[PDB]
From Swiss-Prot:
<protein>
    <recommendedName>
        <fullName>Vasostatin-1</fullName>
    </recommendedName>
</protein>
């Protein structure tokens, strides 16, 4: 059972941001 919270979309977007971020801070 998947917990449909909606936040999973943000998770995957942030995961995408993590892939886009190929530079350090």
């Amino acid at each position: 059972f998947e917990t449909l919270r909606g936040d999973e979309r943000i998770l995957s977007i942030l995961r995408h941001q993590n892939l886009l971020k190929e530079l350090q801070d």
